[PDB]
Curated annotation (Swiss-Prot), chains A, B, C:
Organism whose genome encodes this protein: Salmonella typhimurium (strain LT2 / SGSC1412 / ATCC 700720)
The encoding gene: flgG
PROSITE patterns: FLAGELLA_BB_ROD
GO cellular component: bacterial-type flagellum; bacterial-type flagellum basal body, distal rod
Subunit structure: The basal body constitutes a major portion of the flagellar organelle and consists of four rings (L,P,S, and M) mounted on a central rod. The rod consists of about 26 subunits of FlgG in the distal portion, and FlgB, FlgC and FlgF are thought to build up the proximal portion of the rod with about 6 subunits each.
Protein name: Flagellar basal-body rod protein FlgG
Length: 260, 260, 260
């Protein structure tokens, strides 16, 4: 209709996506291992009318010609993979991570996902699963007569058998690093899957080769900054305010043109 | 948006960082070996509208030109490395430090960490560890037939064997001194790893070369005074209130402006 | 468009600058050595319609002719360089200044800046740097075998070596003073630079030449009068309300001028 109205529509859509991201952040406080997400925006086409070069006279140059431009196309959402603030859960199955690294988990379809969530569980068959039976990699099977479990800083998981005066080592729990942590594609369940952007996964025991360390009895909190989200929400509401104002102004312009 | 909103956003961000630092300081009272932190702030860019020099006429000079300025960027969260108070734990397996010095520790990489926590413990294989299987350096192996253990002010760890009336020298436990204590980067557990600003580690015997002494039966208490932290908290909370008030004022300004 | 509307726009922009200054002042509470700014405004053109002199008759003179006037152009922002409130931070690396004067600092660009922050450090090479690794002036280096540092209120810096019973004089730390401290152009980091409105930097030992004294273990707090800032913010909010109302009135007058 008018070049103005499409531009304002793109602006409204951009503010709406930005509010979607803020709402997803704000809802996911108190979710373990969640990574704050933030939208990066990007301006659209520029309809060039007079070429910014294009010497006007035989000598003059015509600096900074006429170009209009449209749109606010949202180009990406970066995920901030910073260390969450650890919290003392004092729970024997809850393990947190300090530094880079992701737990590897075998999805029932046979593919591997990666989670920064150590809110583990032990099922019927003794496996370490994670809130949904997603069996970890490599498998760790607690003996049926084990009493108490411990997970060292180096990932060595061992149990205290009954009667046995020793912590026999049951399994080894290793992490995985991606040379682009941000490029993982989340599929829900607090899980990410490998894509072309993240690059190949390097699996190693904790500590070695850039991975972090494992802290039993702690859980990683979401790195969502509450005040940042609140001011973001105020700013987004006002930007939406203003863009709808622009839509209405273009409406009034067009309507006065109609009754002409 | 409005410049005011960005400036006040940075103000709330800085005050939240201050509040979180103070909360960590206050919640870690009665944590052995904790080191008190404080945040140091720093203002951001100054948008110069008129340059403070920039003569107007051929005579006049325009003193103190117009520059707005933004932000309260927190330039650091430094850590005060003062000597904590000694308290009689009476436990023979706990040692504290008087003066400079950190107990060196082997991470699973083969690197070095450093901790002022001498509540040493015995693993299954007899190596001295510190709350996490951190095999102290250099390697120290408590004998199986240990009856009592002593650690002098020069750091020699010697044990009483059955039958023999002599404290056989089982190991030596020297401290590590950095030229900049503040520069250390914590990785939790009250452990610090060497970094470029801390300086190269100087490993040396206790008591000599500026180091401190090793006191058995003592634990060093956190250098956090509750009264100081509470007065600091009062000041910070009032600043936080004022900054949120400024954000709300800018909100009201904008929403009325759009009501126009 | 309308003579009313451009004047009202100038009023809105002046109030916006005023809120910017208030928000930067108010966000920089709890910033050591910060100085409050205050914006000074200045009315624009006065379109003369009838000259206030300009005899109408051979005898009458027409007092108080007709001139309309526009604009509220903000002409300057003066930074108030008074003494902040010294507080017992009780740290051997924090020194405040009592009276006039600035610490000179050598930026890596080679040029000189000046700061009223004593929140110093010692980097890996022993030098005193200022929360950002900026080498103070003149050169200084703490010997590696130092145990303490004291800054006499004359400015002489002396450390206590090991063994030696004498605070060997490491160096001398002197201040810099300007005739117009307000003229200094701040560039963030709490560092100002010499501008040609401030004048040549006159460097001298503390005390002499009108420079102030050095107080170790103190930090000079920002001189932001919070009550003045808050009442100013309320006043600015209402003034913005009023100017937007002026824009609204002009808009309605135009709207039923067009409807005609």
């Amino acid at each position: 209709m008018i070049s103005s109205l499409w531009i304002a529509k793109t602006g409204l859509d951009a503010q709406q996506t930005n509010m979607d991201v803020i709402a997803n952040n704000l809802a996911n406080v108190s979710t373990n291992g969640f990574k704050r997400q933030r939208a990066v925006f990007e301006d659209l086409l520029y309809q060039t009318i007079r070429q910014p070069g294009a010497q006007s006279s035989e000598q003059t140059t015509l600096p900074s010609g006429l170009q209009i431009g449209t749109g606010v196309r949202p180009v990406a959402t970066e995920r901030l993979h910073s260390q969450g603030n650890l919290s003392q859960t004092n729970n024997s199955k809850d393990v947190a991570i300090k530094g880079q690294g992701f737990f590897q988990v075998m999805l029932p379809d046979g593919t591997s996902a990666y989670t920064r969530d150590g809110s583990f569980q032990v099922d019927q068959n003794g496996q370490l699963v994670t809130a949904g039976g997603f069996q970890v990699q490599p498998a760790i099977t607690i003996p049926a007569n084990a009493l108490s479990i411990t997970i060292g800083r180096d990932g060595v998981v061992s149990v205290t058998q009954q009667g046995q005066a020793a912590p026999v080592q049951v399994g080894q729990l290793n992490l995985t690093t991606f040379m682009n942590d941000t490029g993982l594609e989340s599929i829900g369940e607090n899980l990410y899957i490998e894509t072309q952007s993240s690059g190949a996964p390097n699996e190693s025991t904790p500590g070695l080769n850039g991975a972090g360390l494992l802290y039993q009895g702690y859980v990683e909190t979401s790195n969502v900054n509450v005040a940042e989200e609140l001011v973001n929400m105020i700013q987004v509401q006002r930007a939406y305010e203003i863009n709808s104002k622009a839509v209405s102004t273009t409406d009034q312009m067009l309507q006065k043109l109609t009754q002409l």
